[PDB]
Amino acid sequence: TLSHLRRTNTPIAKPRQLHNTHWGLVCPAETPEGQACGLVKNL
Amino acid sequence: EGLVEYIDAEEEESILIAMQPEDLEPAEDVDPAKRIRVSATTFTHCEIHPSMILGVAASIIPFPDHNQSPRNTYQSAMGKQAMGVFLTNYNVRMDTMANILYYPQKPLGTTRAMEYLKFRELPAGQNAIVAIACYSGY
Amino acid sequence: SNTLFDDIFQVSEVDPGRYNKVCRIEAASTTQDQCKLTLDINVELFPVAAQDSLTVTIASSLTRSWRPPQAGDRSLADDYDYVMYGTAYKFEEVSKDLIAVYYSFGGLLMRLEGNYRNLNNLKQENAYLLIRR
Amino acid sequence: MNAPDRFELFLLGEGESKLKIDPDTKAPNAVVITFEKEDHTLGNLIRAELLNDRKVLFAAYKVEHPFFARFKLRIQTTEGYDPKDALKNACNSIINKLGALKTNFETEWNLQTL
Amino acid sequence: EEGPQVKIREASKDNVDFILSNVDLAMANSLRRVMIAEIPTLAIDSVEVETNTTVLADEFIAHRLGLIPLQSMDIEQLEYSRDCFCEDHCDKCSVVLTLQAFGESESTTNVYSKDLVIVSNLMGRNIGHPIIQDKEGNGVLICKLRKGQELKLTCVAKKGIAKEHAKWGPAAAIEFEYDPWNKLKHTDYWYEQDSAKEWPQSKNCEYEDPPNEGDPFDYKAQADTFYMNVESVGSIPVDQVVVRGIDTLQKKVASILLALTQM
Amino acid sequence: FDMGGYFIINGSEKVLIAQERSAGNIVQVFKKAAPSPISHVAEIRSALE
Amino acid sequence: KAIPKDQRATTPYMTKYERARILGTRALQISMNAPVFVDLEGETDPLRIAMKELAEKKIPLVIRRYLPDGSFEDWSVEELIVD
Amino acid sequence: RGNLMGKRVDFSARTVISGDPNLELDQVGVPKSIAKTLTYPEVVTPYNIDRLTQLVRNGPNEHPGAKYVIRDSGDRIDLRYSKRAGDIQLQYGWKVERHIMDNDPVLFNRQPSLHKMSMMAHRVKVIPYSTFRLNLSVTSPYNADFDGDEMNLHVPQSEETRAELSQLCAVPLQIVSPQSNKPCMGIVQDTLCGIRKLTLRDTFIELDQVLNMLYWVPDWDGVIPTPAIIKPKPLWSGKQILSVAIPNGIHLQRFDEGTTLLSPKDNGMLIIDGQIIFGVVEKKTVGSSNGGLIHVVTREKGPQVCAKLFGNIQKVVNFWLLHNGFSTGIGDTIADGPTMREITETIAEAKKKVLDVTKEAQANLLTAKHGMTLRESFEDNVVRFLNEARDKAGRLAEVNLKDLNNVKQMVMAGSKGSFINIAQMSACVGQQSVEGKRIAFGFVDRTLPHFSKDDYSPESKGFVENSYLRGLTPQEFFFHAMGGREGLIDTAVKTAETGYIQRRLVKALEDIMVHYDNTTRNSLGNVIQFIYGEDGMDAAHIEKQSLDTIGGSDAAFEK
Amino acid sequence: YDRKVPSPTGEYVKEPEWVLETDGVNLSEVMTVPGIDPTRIYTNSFIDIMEVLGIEAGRAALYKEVYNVIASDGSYVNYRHMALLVDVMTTQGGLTSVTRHGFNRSNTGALMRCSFEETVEILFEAGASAELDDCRGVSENVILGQMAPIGTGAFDVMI
Amino acid sequence: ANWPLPVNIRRIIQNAQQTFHIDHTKPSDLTIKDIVLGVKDLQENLLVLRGKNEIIQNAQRDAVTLFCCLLRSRLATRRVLQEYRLTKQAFDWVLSNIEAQFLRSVVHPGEMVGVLAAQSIGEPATQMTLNTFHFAGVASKKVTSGVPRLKEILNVAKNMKTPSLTVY
Amino acid sequence: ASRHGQKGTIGITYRREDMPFTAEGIVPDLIINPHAIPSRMTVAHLIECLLSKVAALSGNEGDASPFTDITVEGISKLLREHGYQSRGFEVMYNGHTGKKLMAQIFFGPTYYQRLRHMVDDKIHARARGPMQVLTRQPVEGRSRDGGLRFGEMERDCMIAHGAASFLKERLMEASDAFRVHICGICGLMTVIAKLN
Amino acid sequence: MIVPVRCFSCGKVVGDKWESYLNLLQEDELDEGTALSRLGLKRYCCRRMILTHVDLIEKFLRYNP
RNA sequence: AUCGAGAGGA
C-alpha cells in the first residue's frame, strides 16, 4: 500500500532514463518492469 | 535552529555534499577485507545517510549494495505481490480479494529503514531454511 | 590367451598435476635404452615416490558378462597387485620402427615406446595391466 | 485440485498386487520385480543386503518417478539357483539383525537413568 | 550379542544419544526413515465447529489442533478408521475430544490443551491424552479470546502415519553421523587455505582414533559405527520410538515374505 | 497501521497519483535541426499561479 | 494440358510433405472402417498400420505435383522411392 | 490482423510449466484435470470398440473416459448429463469424442513464438499436479524457465492433422536447427554440470552405485562392463559407465589447443564405438554445439535414436549427481587476500595511468591523434583503459579459483555464466555506461552533487572499483542503477522495434517456397532464386567441413 | 589492416597494409583518383554502390552489410537466409524496401497485400482499379480459410 | 578453408575404419581404376536438378561444383591408400553411402523458406535483445550500433547515420 | 521468491525423509539450484543467508543495512565461533541412501516471500463451448471459459513446418465454419436458399 | 498470528514456550541468545520459530465484537 | 455481454 500511495505517473528527449537529478527524490530502482517502465516512478 | 535546510534539485546545482557525514570531514593501519572508498574541504551540507535515496520496496532489500541493480528493481515489483497481513482490520473490510499469510515472521536481516517502514511488525514472508543444492533435478 | 610382455621400470618423475587420486608417472626402462613410458597410476590406491622400481606385465586373459568373483579363485596375481583393464587405439611410429602403443584404461592412459616392436602385441581389443612390488 | 490423495502412498488400490514378477527379456536367470506402494526404505535395504550374498551376480533398484512411490528391483544370480529364493533368503538376514537390535537396545536402555 | 552392538552414553526422557556398532549403512538409514514416517501415532483428524467468534478463522484453529501432541503409547491395540467396521468413527478406532472456553474475564482469556476433555469411552488404555511438558502445566497455547468470544468444538482423532501428514510423526529431530574423521573419504572438503583450521572438530572425536600422517589410505574399509540422537515429541516416550521403528520396519519387511508366498 | 490518504468513493478506496509535467515560466533553449527551415528556438510555457 | 508418361524431372523421392499427407489421407481411410490391405500383425492405430502399408508400397493413390506454369506431373506411391 | 490471420481457437490449454528430468524428450506432462476436458473425435472401428465402449462407461471423470457420442443422424449425446450414459450401444461409424490418452499428438508452444522451433509436436503423459511438465533439454528452443513462465498446448481433430504434427513438427524431427545448422537442444544445468564431475579422471565409482547406474538406462543389454581397475579394490571410472548411454556405432574426434593423444590436462575428446577413450565431457561435446555428440548421433540413424539418448544421459548423470551433490557459497566469490591486494593495485595503476592520459588533455598537447579526433576522443581512450583493468582482474581472479571453487565448475562446464560474471562477483563490477558512453553529465558540468564540477576521472563518470562481495558505494550504487535501468528500458521498447523488424521480414518473404523444379518463387511466378540457397540444399543437413585444398605449402601439396 | 595473401612459396602469410578510413561518401569520383586500387574500393553505403557499380554489386553489398550486423560477435546464420532476404530486395529492379512502400505494391494479390501495414486504401484501390486477386498466396487462403498451397498442400491427391 | 558443406566425409571415413577395420600394416586391394574411374562416376549421379535439355544439365554442374572440390580432395589417391587405407568393399560402401547421403540433403519441394528466411533474421535480434540485458554494462555493440543500423538496411536508408568510405 | 529477484516455482515436494539432512538433523525447508546464482548475479542472497544464521544462533537481529561497515569476512569470524564453518556450509547426507553427499552444501535461513500466481488460479482448458456474436469466434479469458488466441505470429510458425490441413483446422473447425450461398454469375451473398 | 504449534523444519514442540519466552526476556531480564537456550532450543531451525515470531493476535484482540 | 480506463505476469 505504501509504495502505491506515493506513485508518480508521467504522460506520453530521453524519458524513462534514470537521470542524475533523480538522486534522492525518486527511487533509482523502484519502477514497473515493461509496459510503462521508467515513466511511472516512486518517491 | 539553522541545523537542516530543505533543498530541491534546482537549488542542488550550486552545492557540495558529503556522504557519509564524517568520512568526509575530519583529520588525516586499515582493513583489507573492507570495501574501497574514494575520499574537497569546501562543502556546503552533508547528506543525512546515503541509504535514503531508496524508496519503500527498495529499503526492504538486505544488502542491496551487494546486489546487481536490475535485480533490486525486479524485487521491488515483487514486494508488492508478496503475501502477508496488509491490515489488521481485514476481518470487517469487504474488499474484493485479500490474502493473509497463515504465519508471518519478521525477517532476520533488517535494513535500518524497515523500522520506519513498519515491516518488523507486519511482515510478508517466512525465514525458511534454504539449501543451495543440486538434488533430484526437479 | 597367455602372458604378453613384462619389463622392469624406474620412476623419473611423479607430478601431482591438478588431481588427488590418479597421478601421472614417468618411468624409464631397465637394461633396454630404446624405451620410454608415461602412465596413469591411482596414487590413492598404490603409492609411488621418486626413484621407485616396479614390474610391469601386460597380458590379455587373466561375450561373457563380467562376474564378481565367487572365490574360487581364478587366478591371477597375489603377485600382481595393481591391475587395470583397458583398450588399444592408435599406433605410432618415429624411427620406423620404433614404434609405440596407446592404451586407455577407462580414461587413465598409457604410452609405451621402443622396438622390439612385437606383434606378440595385438591390434586388438583386450588388454590387462599388472604391477607388483 | 489435481493433487493425488495423500494415502495413495501405502493404500493399495483395487486390482493391485504388492508384488509383480516378470523375467528380464534380455539376460537369462534374472528377474525384475515390481515393488508396489513403497519407497527406498525398502528399496535401499533389500539391495544392499543382496550384496553380502556371493551367489548373486546382479542387484539394483530405481525410483521410477517420485510421483508414484513404487520401485523396481533387478536380480541376477548364479545358474540354477532361483532369484525368488535369493530375495527370500536375503530378507531373513535383515529380520534377524533387526530382531537382535531390539534386544541389545533394550539391554542398554534398561541400565541407564533418566 | 549376535549382531548389532548398540551402546548408550546419554539417555533422557526426551533424548536418546547412542552409538550403533557393526551394521551396514543401508539399515541405519532405513531405520531413521521409518522413525520419521512409518511409525503410527494418533492426532486430531476431524473437527466440527459449532460456534467460533475468535479472530482466528475456522480451518485455522482446526489445522492447529491436528498438530497438538497426543499420548499414543497404547496405540498398537487401536484400529485405523480405514481398517475398522463402523460408520465414520467409533470407540475401537477413534478417540474423541472436546474443547470449550468462553471469554468471561475482561483481561485476555487463554485456551490451552489442558482445556481438552476426553469424551468417548477410553476402554481403559493409555491413549489420547493432551501431553503437557509445560513448567506451569498448560501445554501449548491453542488460541486467544477477548471479552465475550466463544469456542465450542468436537475433535475426532484417528490413527495415522507421517506419510499421510506431518502431525502423525513422533519424530522431532534425528541426529545422524558416521566417520567424523574422514577415514572412508565419502566426502571431499571445501577449503581455502587449510582443511583443519577452517572446518570444526566434531562432537564425535573422543572414542575415534585420528589417522596419523604417514599412513596410506585404506581402500576397502566400510561404514561401521554410527552416532545417533533421537528426540521425541512426547507422544511415545523415547525408548518406544526407536523400538517400533525397528518393528514396523520389520513388520512390512515381513509383508513381502508373506505376499511372495501368496504368489 | 493505515496511514490514510485515499478518497473513499462508491465503497472502494482511490488514490491520486502525482501527475508529472514540465515546469512553466522557465526560459528554455531548443535546437532543433534545420532541414527543416529553422535552427534555434527559445520557448517558455507561460501561465499564472 | 498435362505431362506424358516420359519426361519426368521432378524429385523421384517422397517429399516429407507427400509422406505425411499420404500417411494422413490413409489414416482417415483406415479409421472409417474402409478395407485394410496388408496383414495386420496385431496393431489397431490408423497411424501405425499405414506406416506398414508404406513399407510395402500398397497405397493406390497418386500424387499430382503442380508446376508454376500450370501443367502437372503424376507419380504414384508404388512408383516413388520412400526415404 | 486480429480476427482472420489470428483466430481464437478451441481445444487449447495454458499453465505454469515445471522441469521433469524423468520424462523423455518428445513428451509433455499434461495435468489430469486438463486431460479430463480436452477431447479428440475418433470414429468407431471394429479395431477399437473394445477400448471405446469401456471409455464411455468410465464417463467424464475417471481419466480414461469421455464426453459426447455422435450418431448416424447428426444427433449429439452429452455424457455428464443424459439418462442413458450408463450403456449405449456403439455402432460402426459413430464419433466418440474422448479424453486424451497417453502417446497422443499435440502441439506445445510458447509465446513469443519467434521461430518454428517455439512450436513443437509432443507425446502426452497424463500426470497429477496441475503443472505442465517438460524435459530439461527441450528447454533451449522454446526459451523457457520454470520461474513461472507459462506455456500453451493444442489438440488436432483429424487423423491427418495428427499425422501432420507427428511427422513434421515432432520434437525429434526438429532437433538439428534448419536455421543455424547446429542442434538447438543440449544437455543443460544439473545434467551438464555433473556430466563434467562424473567424467573427471579423478572420479571413480564402485559396485553399489555402478550396479545401480546400469539399471537406470532402459536400453541396457544386461552386460556389466569390466571395471577399468581390478587392483586391491574393484572400481570403474566416471568415464567408464557413461559409455553405457553412448549407443553402438558412434564416433567423435576433437583436439583442443592443449591436446596430445595423451592429454595430460585431459583436453579435447575421443570416442570409439560408444565408448569414451579420454577427455572431459562438457558443453563443447555434450552441448547444443556444432561438432558435438548430439549432431553426430542424430545424422547417423537417426532422429528418435538421438532423442532417446538425451533422456538416458540425464537419468544417469542426475543419479550420480543426486548422491554426490553440489552447491555454491559466499566463499565462492572470495579470492586470495594477497590477490585482492593485486587487484586493487591493478586498478590503482590503471587509475594512476588514467591520471597520466588525463593530465595530458589538460596540458594539453596532447599528441591529439589524427582521427581519433577528437573530441571523440579522450572519452574513448579511458573506456578501454578501464575495460582492460577489468578483464585482467577477472583473469587474476580465475587462477585464484582452485579446482573445487563451486563457481568455476559451472563455468568450466558452461552450465551457466562465464568470465564477466566472475569478474564482477569477485574483483570489480566495472565502468557502467549509458548509451555506450560513460555516465553522462546531468548536473551542469558534473555527474552528482558529491563531486566538484568537471570531473572526467573514472570514480566520477561511473567506475566501480569495488566488487559485489565488498558491496558498492552509494556514489557508485546509483550509477550501476543508472545503467541497469537502461537494459530494462529496451525490454519493453527496443523490443518493439525488433519484433516489428521481424513482422515485416515475415510478411515480405512469406510465400517464398521452393517449387517442384527447385526454383524459388512467389505467388505470381516471379523467380527469386533458381536453386535454393544457390546449391539446392536444406540447411539442417549441413556441417562445417574443412576444405584442405586451400591452406598449406606447394611442397605440402606435392607429397 | 591485416590480410591473408598468396606468398609465392605456397603458404598464406599475414600481410600488413595501410588502408584509409573516411567519414564521407562520394564514390562517383574517389575511385577515379590516381594512386588507389579501383577494384577493392568499399563504401559501407550500398545505396550508392548500387548506382555506381550496378545492381549486381549491390546484391553483394547489401548482403555483406547484413553480415556485418548479424555475424560479428559470434552470431551465425547460414548464408541461405540472408541471401534469400537479399534476393527478394533485388529482382524487382531497384532496391525494394522492406516496408509498406516497396513490396506492398508489386502487382501482388490484394488480399495478401491487405494483411500488412496499409489496410483499407489497398482494398479501396482494389475495388477502384477493379483488381482480380490471384488466390495463390499464403495469406489469401488463410483469410479465405483454406488449405493454402503451402507445404503439405503443394499437390492434390487422386487414384 | 572451414566452410559449411553438405554430407560429412571426414565422418564416413572414421565410420569406415572401425566397421571393417583394416587396419594394419596390410595393404589395399583396389586398382587405380577402381579409385579414379569411380569418383568421376559418383560425381555423375550426385544430382540436385534433373532433366534432359542443355540449360538444366549445365546449372546442375554449377551447383555441385564446390561440394565436389571437397569430394575430389578427400577421395584422392595418395590419401585413400596412405592415411586412410580402404578396401574394395569399404570403398564401394563409402561411395554408395555418400550418394545415399547426398540426395537426402536436397531441399524438399514444399519447404517454405520465405518464412524460414525469416525468422531468423528477425529472431536472435529480438532475443539478442529481450534477453535483454542481462544485466549491466557496457553492453552492446549489439543492440545499439546496431539494431538501429538494421532498421536502416531494410527501409532503404538515404539519410545514412554513419557514412564511411574505405579506400585500398 | 526471496528478497533479491530470485523467482522459481516449486518443481516437486519431497517429505522429510527423501530430503537431505545434516549431522544435527536440520532438514531444509527449501532447495534452490546453485545454478540461479551467478547468472543472475545476486551475491547478497548469499550474504543474507549467512547473516541470518548468525542472527538465529546468537539471538541478535542482524544488520542488513546497505552502506555500512559489514564484511562477509566479518560474519565469517562470528559464524566460525558458533560451531559451524565460516562460509555457510554443512556436511549433508543424502536421504535416499544415508550416504554422505560428496560435496558440502551451503545451508541457512533466507527470508522467502510467497508471491501470488498459483497454478490453480491459472490453469485453463477449453474445447468448444461459448462464443461471441460479432465474430462467432471463442470469447476471451478463462473467466468465461474461453479459447486461446492463435495470434498472427503463431500462424507464421505453422507455415514454417508447412502444416497445411492443420491451418485449415485451426482456422475452421476450431473457430468459424459458416456456409453461404453464392451466385454463379453475380457471385455474392444475396441468394435465397429456401430449404430444406 | 499466534505462535505455531511445533516448528516446520525439525518438528519439536514450540507452542508451549511463547508464554515462558516473554518471561525470560522481560521479568528477570536476559538477552535472547541465552533465552532460547534455557528453553531447550539448540537447533537453529527450531530457534527461529520463536525469535522471528510476531504475535499479531494481540492487535486482533484489541477489536470489539 | 459490448465500448472505454488501469494494474500485473512471462
Ligand SMILES: Nc1nc2c(ncn2[C@@H]2O[C@H](COP(=O)(O)OP(=O)(O)OP(=O)(O)O)[C@@H](O)[C@H]2O)c(=O)[nH]1
Ligand atoms: N514479448 C515479451 N516477452 C518478454 C517480456 N519480458 C520478458 N519476456 C520474456 O520472458 C523472459 C524474462 O526473463 P526470464 O524468463 O525470467 O529469464 P532470465 O533472463 O533468467 O531473467 P529472470 O529469470 O527473471 O531473472 C525473457 O526471456 C523473454 O522471453 C516482454 O515485455 N515482452
Ligand SMILES: [Mg+2]
Ligand atoms: Mg523466466
Ligand SMILES: [Mg+2]
Ligand atoms: Mg529465469
Ligand SMILES: [Zn+2]
Ligand atoms: Zn470404527
Ligand SMILES: [Zn+2]
Ligand atoms: Zn445474383
Ligand SMILES: [Zn+2]
Ligand atoms: Zn525446527
